[PDB]
Write a protein that binds this ligand. Structure first.
Ligand SMILES: [Fe+2]
Length: 669
């Protein structure tokens, strides 16, 4: 007799009352269909049955599951099935899928296999038919012109059940944003799009009720040059600043203009040569359409150039700001020596520009859309039994779902994104298109990305915590993927000859990245080392990178003056005119402020049962060597947690974002 154990998921709607039939596919043969229990498989339940067979089957190759309607359709989430055979063998069959009753589900045992491992028809047939089904199920589509290709579905409910959120409205922008505004006691402002705050105190009264540790600090110090500069290294969008190797001709700033800022008795030009000058250049925003979806509110964008300076205390501070790209009499170079509110407003404009690039490029394009490309390629080209599928499936969990929700509710035409954002209404689509033209594989390789911006020296630039922690997590993942690769690939030739791996890599290149020559993405992978790097790009982007740029949004943007989602007047074209009252009226109205707060709060939340880096409750892998690799991965992450903990004890303002205990496995929000 076989002992057959069936485990139902613990999600809300995991249970089913329908009929479940099970049969066993063996070498010598097959078993008859067996109806199970005629009862209910409740959520969280494990059901085991005693099954005697009418024939000796030999070694079990596959388990088939079939769900038939009893009443109405009732989704069933199947975690796994295990067998205890007459011969005393214990076999596990990982599933972790929604069974809708539409189709039969056929499972391999959990041992990871390359195509070259399968030689008998039973297995080859199953493998090929699985991929045929996958490629009918998961298809590419161009959502907007020039975008990376994404899933062929126009709304969340159109997705295959297997890649939907566990609930339909569980993670939902419309609902989550509105609940957020309720929790922040700002519900009453949700429509006040024509009302400015009376003054900073007016917003402050609203804000102190809902501030956390960091945003309260921002409230108290946002006007300081030190805190302005700090954010380029350790804020929510610490990926733009680079070391200037020569002053741009489009920024005609002189030593005499910034002499008061310089502390080494050197000319500006010589400070550049010493590597003490840094720059943030928002040329990408130049020519982007401003939000016009509200005809009663004019909104405005800039494209600033910010020149920064590493002072004697090794802090990077702003010394000059030109708010538009082309120099001229109506495009002043503002300085910390200007009138109080001239310099402040200039900084605010830079902060606003930083927020635009963060939301659409750093966050949306470079973590969300990228991760969806890897995910779709994975589903299309890698069967469940493949070791790379088992490795990566955990790191694209809910990614296609959250992205489809966004395209359905947030960033579509007339979506929520259009309410508060100056780039809303088409501008954000333009940014993605233009950034895509310059998106490279190298720029996703963390250590290379840091060096490409000239920010790698810990000696010259000691307070770049995003860099430090990022490098540690990157290496931890690189070590882990390398061990996994070495377990299932005996050499480089085996990697090169893996046809499914090549098709995976090829799908990312041709469809995901549109077959763009300058993308730098591999067309194929032909060594264990190259494969390891590739897998690290996928996992790091999906986990660490997304965490670093996502979960600090409320911390840094909740005090709106430090991250305005829009501006209601053009950049000042002259000095000595701006007043504090004008600034208040330029900042977002109460309405757009409300939606802004709601959004950045909602996006910064962890789920109650969030899965963090290295947590793999879904045992797709069942073999001991890889389990031990995972164990070492976890131990390495713990060591990093301690490193970061000790580093943060000596900081004015702890940088927590890349603490592995706080890094989710995947892009899920
Ligand atoms: Fe995100």
């Amino acid at each position: 007799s076989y002992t057959v154990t069936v485990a139902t998921g613990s999600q809300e709607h995991a249970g089913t009352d329908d009929y479940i039939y099970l049969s066993l596919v063996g070498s010598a043969g097959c078993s008859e269909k067996h109806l199970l229990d005629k009862g209910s498989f409740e959520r969280g339940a494990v059901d085991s049955y005693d099954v005697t067979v009418d024939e000796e089957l030999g070694e079990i190759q596959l388990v088939r599951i079939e769900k038939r309607k009893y009443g109405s359709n009732d989704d069933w989430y199947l975690k796994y099935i295990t067998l205890k055979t007459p011969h005393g063998d214990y076999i596990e069959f990982p599933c972790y899928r929604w069974i809708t009753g539409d189709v039969e589900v056929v499972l391999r045992d959990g041992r990871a296999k390359l195509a070259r491992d399968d030689q008998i028809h039973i297995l080859k047939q199953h493998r090929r038919k699985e991929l045929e089904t996958r490629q009918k199920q998961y298809r590419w589509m161009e959502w907007n012109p020039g975008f990376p290709l994404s899933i062929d579905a126009k709304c969340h409910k159109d997705l295959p059940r297997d890649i939907q959120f566990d609930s339909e409205k569980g993670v939902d922008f419309v609902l989550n944003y509105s609940k957020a505004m309720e929790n922040l006691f700002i519900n009453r402002f949700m429509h006040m799009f024509q009302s400015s705050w009376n003054d900073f105190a007016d917003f402050e009264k609203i804000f102190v009720k809902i501030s956390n540790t960091i945003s309260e600090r921002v409230m108290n110090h946002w006007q300081e040059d030190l805190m302005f500069g700090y954010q380029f290294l350790n804020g929510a969008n610490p990926v733009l600043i680079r070391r200037c190797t020569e002053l741009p001709e489009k920024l005609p700033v002189t030593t005499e203009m910034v002499e008061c800022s310089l502390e080494r008795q050197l000319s500006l030009e010589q400070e550049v040569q010493q590597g003490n000058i840094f720059i943030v250049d928002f040329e990408l925003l130049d020519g982007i359409d401003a939000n016009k979806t509200d005809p009663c509110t004019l909104q405005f964008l800039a494209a600033p150039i910010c020149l920064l300076y590493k002072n004697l205390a090794n802090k990077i501070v702003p010394i000059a700001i030109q708010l538009n790209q082309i120099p001229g009499d109506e495009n002043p170079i503002f300085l910390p020596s200007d009138a109080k509110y001239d310099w402040l407003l200039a900084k605010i404009w830079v902060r606003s520009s930083d927020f635009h690039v963060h939301q659409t490029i750093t966050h949306l394009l470079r973590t969300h859309l990228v991760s969806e490309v890897f995910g779709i390629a994975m589903y299309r080209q890698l069967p469940a039994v493949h070791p790379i599928f088992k490795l990566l499936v955990a790191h694209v969990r809910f990614t296609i779902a959250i992205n489809t929700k966004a395209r359905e509710q947030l960033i579509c035409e007339c979506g929520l994104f259009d309410k508060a954002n100056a780039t809303g209404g088409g501008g954000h689509v333009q940014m993605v298109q233009r950034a895509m033209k310059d998106l490279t594989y190298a720029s996703l390789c963390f250590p290379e990305a840091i060096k490409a911006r000239g920010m790698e020296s810990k000696e010259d630039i000691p307070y770049y915590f995003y860099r430090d922690d990022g490098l540690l997590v990157w290496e931890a993942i690189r070590t882990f993927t390398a061990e996994v690769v070495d377990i299932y690939y005996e050499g480089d030739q085996v990697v090169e000859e893996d046809p499914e791996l090549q098709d995976f890599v090829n799908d990312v290149y041709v469809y995901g990245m549109r077959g763009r020559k300058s993308s730098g993405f591999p067309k194929s992978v032909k060594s264990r080392e190259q494969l390891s790097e590739y897998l690290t790009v996928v996992i790091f982007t999906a986990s660490a990178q997304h965490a670093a740029v996502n979960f600090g949004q409320y911390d840094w943007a909740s005090w709106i003056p430090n991250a305005p989602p829009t501006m209601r007047a053009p950049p000042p074209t002259a000095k000595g005119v701006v007043t504090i009252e004008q600034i208040v009226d330029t900042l977002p109205d109460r309405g757009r402020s409300c939606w802004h707060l709601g959004a950045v709060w909602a996006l910064s939340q962890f789920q109650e049962n969030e899965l963090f880096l290295g947590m793999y409750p879904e045992e797709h892998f069942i073999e001991k060597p890889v389990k031990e690799a995972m164990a070492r991965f976890r131990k390495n992450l713990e060591a990093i947690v301690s490193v970061i903990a000790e580093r943060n004890e000596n900081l004015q303002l702890p940088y927590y974002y890349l603490d592995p205990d706080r890094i989710p496995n995947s892009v899920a929000i």
